[PDB]
Structures are given as C-alpha cells and as structure tokens.
Amino acid sequence: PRKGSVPKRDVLPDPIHNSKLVTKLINKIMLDGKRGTAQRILYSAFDLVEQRSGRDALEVFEEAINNIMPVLEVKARRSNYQVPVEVRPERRTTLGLRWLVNYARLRGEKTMEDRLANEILDAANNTGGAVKKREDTHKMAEANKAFA
Amino acid sequence: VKKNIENGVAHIRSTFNNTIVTITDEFGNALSWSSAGALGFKGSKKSTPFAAQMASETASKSAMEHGLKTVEVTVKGPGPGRESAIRALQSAGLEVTAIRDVTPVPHNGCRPPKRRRV
RNA sequence: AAAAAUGG
RNA sequence: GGCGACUUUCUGGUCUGUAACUGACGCUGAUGUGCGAAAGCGUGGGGAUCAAACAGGAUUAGAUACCCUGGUAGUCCACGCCGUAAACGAUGAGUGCUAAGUGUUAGGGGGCCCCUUAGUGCUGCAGCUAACGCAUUAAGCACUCCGCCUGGGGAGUACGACCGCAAGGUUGAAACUCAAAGGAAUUGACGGGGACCCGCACAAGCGGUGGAGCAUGUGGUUUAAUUCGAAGCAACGCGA
RNA sequence: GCGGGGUGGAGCAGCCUGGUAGCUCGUCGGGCUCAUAACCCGAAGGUCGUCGGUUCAAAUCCGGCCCCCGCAACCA
RNA sequence: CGCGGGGUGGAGCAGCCUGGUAGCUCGUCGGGCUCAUAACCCGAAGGUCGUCGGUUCAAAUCCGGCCCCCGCAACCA
Numbered sequence A: 001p002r003k004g005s006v007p008k009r010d011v012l013p014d015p016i017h018n019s020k021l022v023t024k025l026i027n028k029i030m031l032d033g034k035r036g037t038a039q040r041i042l043y044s045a046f047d048l049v050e051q052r053s054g055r056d057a058l059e060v061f062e063e064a065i066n067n068i069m070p071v072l073e074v075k076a077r078r079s080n081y082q083v084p085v086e087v088r089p090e091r092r093t094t095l096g097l098r099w100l101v102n103y104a105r106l107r108g109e110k111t112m113e114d115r116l117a118n119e120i121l122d123a124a125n126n127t128g129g130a131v132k133k134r135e136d137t138h139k140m141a142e143a144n145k146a147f148a
Numbered sequence B: 001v002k003k004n005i006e007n008g009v010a011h012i013r014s015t016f017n018n019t020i021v022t023i024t025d026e027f028g029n030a031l032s033w034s035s036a037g038a039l040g041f042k043g044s045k046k047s048t049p050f051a052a053q054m055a056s057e058t059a060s061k062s063a064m065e066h067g068l069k070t071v072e073v074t075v076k077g078p079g080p081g082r083e084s085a086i087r088a089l090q091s092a093g094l095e096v097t098a099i100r101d102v103t104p105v106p107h108n109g110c111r112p113p114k115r116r117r118v
Numbered sequence C: 001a002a003a004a005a006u007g008g
Numbered sequence D: 001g002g003c004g005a006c007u008u009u010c011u012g013g014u015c016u017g018u019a020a021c022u023g024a025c026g027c028u029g030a031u032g033u034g035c036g037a038a039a040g041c042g043u044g045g046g047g048a049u050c051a052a053a054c055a056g057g058a059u060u061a062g063a064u065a066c067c068c069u070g071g072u073a074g075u076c077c078a079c080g081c082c083g084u085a086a087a088c089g090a091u092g093a094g095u096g097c098u099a100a101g102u103g104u105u106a107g108g109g110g111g112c113c114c115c116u117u118a119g120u121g122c123u124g125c126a127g128c129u130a131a132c133g134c135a136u137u138a139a140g141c142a143c144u145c146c147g148c149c150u151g152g153g154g155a156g157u158a159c160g161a162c163c164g165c166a167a168g169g170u171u172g173a174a175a176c177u178c179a180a181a182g183g184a185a186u187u188g189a190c191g192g193g194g195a196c197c198c199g200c201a202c203a204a205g206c207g208g209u210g211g212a213g214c215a216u217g218u219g220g221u222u223u224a225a226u227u228c229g230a231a232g233c234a235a236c237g238c239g240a
Numbered sequence E: 001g002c003g004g005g006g007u008g009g010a011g012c013a014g015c016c017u018g019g020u021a022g023c024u025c026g027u028c029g030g031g032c033u034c035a036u037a038a039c040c041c042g043a044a045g046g047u048c049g050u051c052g053g054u055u056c057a058a059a060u061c062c063g064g065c066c067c068c069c070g071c072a073a074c075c076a
Numbered sequence F: 001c002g003c004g005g006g007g008u009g010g011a012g013c014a015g016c017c018u019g020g021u022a023g024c025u026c027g028u029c030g031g032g033c034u035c036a037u038a039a040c041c042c043g044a045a046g047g048u049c050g051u052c053g054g055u056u057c058a059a060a061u062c063c064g065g066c067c068c069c070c071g072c073a074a075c076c077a
C-alpha cells in the first residue's frame, strides 16, 4: 500500500567544519528542537577529543564513524527467516550516528560533551559500545550468511 | 602413512536434508569425507547451497593435501547443493574431468512410502 | 511446509 | 471385475471384405447358474519393500491423530471360502430413424485427396431437460422385454428364512416421530482460496501511556441525597 | 497385634540430619478476546491431625488421643 | 584389605593423556523474531575444577595426605 519512494532531505554543511555528517550528528543529538544546545554540546565534544588525542577532530570522528558503520544487516523475509542483506550508504551513516549517540548517552561520564567525546574516542580506537553493536550485527549476519 | 594419487573420483550425495562429499581412488577407497552435519550446519541450513559448497571445499582441500589433481564428479540425489559442490570442487584447484549423475532411477520394483499429509 | 478450540 | 518386461505352449472374443451355404434358427429374461476390486477368513509355503494393530519420539490445553523412528498381520504364491465397493458414464438390453465440424485406433474401396465399416474423443443443430446439460457413443424420435421408485427419519434396523468357518451377505417391516427432507440454479456473505490495489495497516523511525504526586471523568461503595443521561471500536477532560 | 501415614482448596515434597514450609493444579487481580477457553504478568492462601514433653528454638526429636492405609489374626 | 575409575557454573558432559588458556548441551537474564506462542539467531551473568599440602616462571592438568561414590577381587580371633 505505497505508491513509491519519497525525496530525501539534504542538510547544510557544518558552519565551521563544513561536514554534512557533522550537521546530521547535530540533528541526532538535538532534543525538543534545542539546536543551540546540540551545537554547543557537539563542539565542546570535538574540542575535548582534539585536546585528548592531538589529532584533527574531523579525522578522528571520520575514523570513528567508519569503525561503527555496518555493512550487513539481518532483515526478515518469507517459511520466515532472517536473511543477511547489504546496507545502503545512507543507512550506514544513519546507523553510525544513531548508535554513536545512543551509546554515548549511556556512558558514565557526567556531561553529554564528555560522554560524546569519550564515545567517539573509543569508536576511533575500535573498542566502543557502538563498535560492539556493529560487531554483533556483523556476526549474526555471518551466522545467517547461508540464507543469503 | 601418506597416499599419493593423481586421478580420483569425488562422490557428492545431495539430499533435501544434508549434503555429503567424499574423494576416493578410481577403485573406490575413501581418503576423507565432509558433510554439512560435520561442518556444523543444523536443520534448514544443511540443505542450503552454501553448506554444500563448504563441504566440497573441505573435502577437496583434504584430497589435494593427499595429492589429488584430476577428479571425476559422481552426483547422487536431487538436492539443491550439487551445483555449488561442483563449483567449489572447480575453485579448489582440482580439475573436473567429467560430471555424471548416478542417481539410482528405480524401475517399477519397490513400493515407495506413504505420501505425507503435512 | 509448526499449533491456534468454542459461541441457545 | 480388470489386463502393461520378454520367450514358448494351450485357449476365448471382436472388427473388415466377398455373398458359397442354413433360411427367422431372433430380442429380452423372473426363477436358476457362474464370474466378480480391495479388505477379510482356512490350510500350507514365502517374506524384500510397504504397512492396519502396536511401541517409542514430537505437536497440542489434551492428541488414543495428522508429522518422525521402528513394526506384526497383511501385501506375494497354491488351493478353498467370502460375494461386497462412489463394482460409476451415479445412464439395463435389443432394434430402427433424426444437421454438421474435427482428432485418433483397426481395416476396406476409388483417384496427397475422396468415399466407407467398426470403435474411441472433442465441438455443435433440431429435439429433450427443473436447470445443469445430453445431442448418430442421446439424456432426441419410436417399439419389445427386464430390473427398480413412490416424503424425511426410524432403517438397510428388528423378527423370520436362506447362505457363510467367521466377519458378515441376501431378503426385509412396523410402532413412533417431523412438515419438511431433496435437485439445479441465483444474489449476497464468508474462507486458516486466488489476483490486483489502498490506509501510520506493516516495515524504517521519533515520542508517549501502563510505575510516582496532583487535576479530571467513570465504575464501585458510603450517604438523607451523593440529580439524570452516555457503555467495545463509535461511553469514561463525554451533555458540562 | 505390628508397622506406615495425617503439611494452603486437591495431589505430592520437605522429617532421616531442629534454626530454611517447596512443586503441579486450583483460587483472586490485571492483561489478550466481540465473549469464553487457552495463554501472559502479579498476588493471597497451611498456627504442619490434636494434646503433653525435651530444647534457647519443634513439620522435624519423644510420649498419649483421634483418623486413614497395609500386613497379621494360626493348631485343634 | 588390593586394584582401577569418578568428584568441574543451577543440572548433564569435555579439557587431565602431553603444564599454561577453564570449553560443549541444557537452565536463567536481555535483544532480534512473530497477530501473538513455539522454534530459531545474537549478547550476558553464571564453577576457579571434592578438600589440605608438595615440585615448578606457570597446576583442573604433575606428586602426596585426606572425604565420599562405583566395578571386580580378597577376608578361619
């Protein structure tokens, strides 16, 4: 019961970094429309990761998203079995940012800027909660690899 | 404690419940065998072509370790994994001299079991 | 191609 | 009823063409007398497979089933018995007459074609039929003989008789009870039928309710009264 | 006469070895359903047959009263 | 009495042979799954290996003492 696919929205680049991914991360972090709170939180987290890593904030964030972006997922089809299926590039970015923020919000730090900075650092090191989520997704996709 | 042969026969039996592969000499002596059940697959997965491909690859690796180079394919059963087994045998490096399906076509002899009502 | 009864 | 590897022996029936031969010797067929799928029974043999019963394993609320693993009788053979099937084309046999088109099997006659006999299919007039349909293989038009029916249930039961080793078979009521049972076709509705489509229906997401304090409506209970109405979705911040 | 037993509504553990009452079904409340059943979540329910004793403490160990079960009740 | 074997998450089995590492099947918790339910897939927690000693850089593993269970065998105060 659906005529087709709808056009997708296009966000503007980050004002300072000029990165659509940064803009989309700001949108993910934003709650109740508090765009300013989202922006300040993200910039503080970027500054903290820059300070703690001595490497470009954009470079480390790109590494983190590359680490926490999945390639395969398990989508049920039917007599009914979950089948591994490649993930679209936009689903990759969506899932990477979504998992990043979701598992940042669960960290034990006091402030969201600290939580996000630590999470992006751990993801860049390939040892974060979002990384664990991606690993579980990939292994279960492999487990169901036969049904592909 | 080593067997060295150049030509041989790979027997692949593919039934809707499992796939079995073995390699023997031209006079039918077994060296190693591989089945989806041994590989690990259970239930539905044992019928999938992937399990057949894995079993054929394992069996072919053992056969070439013993030193097999050329092999003739002997196919039995209507299962779906026969083609995957053939392709795995080819890709393992063994040379497929010829393929033949030796599934036993019964003449009018014995009465088959009852048709299932499920 | 799992199982899913009944209703003055 | 049934009959499917091949070979040999014995043996039944059917069709085609001549018109030597008999010259109505025919049709039907109560009672009789025989054959008759499968299961089953008796004696003896055989026994792979399959598989009632049975035993486990599953499923399930239960599962004395469906599914899985086994498995005895039986399935096979000889000789007896049984004599029943949706033993069906749900259509007795014989005979003649009544448009056509087209396939196929076994023949025959005339020039790849035409005609013809006997079957076996499909389509289709007249006619028939409640309709569905039948339609030279009639369910049409006619004549002969036979069998059979007379609302549903009780009941193919009871009694009696005959038959059978048995299982049972054949024949076969009544009391009583109902105003219905039925056939075909039609329009809906429905289906753990099909096809094609829609909807925040699902999927992909985001945010809630259900836990706490409070506001409010409702139920219940209390009260002299706790005014009446609203009750699944489509009553309960609803009349207000 | 001798043994064994009596524990939420039912059936059955726990006793041997004192400090701890368990399981299945049933009941009640909420949920699911158009409704019932099934099902899911949560809860209540036994002074351990009844009297005495030992013990700091008794379902538990010991002795009576009651009830049930089983076995025995033989020789003339 | 002699000879063997066994004791490992809540249950049932490996790993001991030959020193490192605690694995496998059920069970509980969370997630995917579905109209639920089951089945199935993925994440966790779960014994420090019967107990006390001994040799080693290192012990479930090797060597002793001890506590139980099983098999066979022995037993003329």
Ligand SMILES: [Mg+2]
Binding pocket: C007
């Ligand atoms: Mg009704």
Ligand SMILES: [Mg+2]
Binding pocket: none
């Ligand atoms: Mg109910």
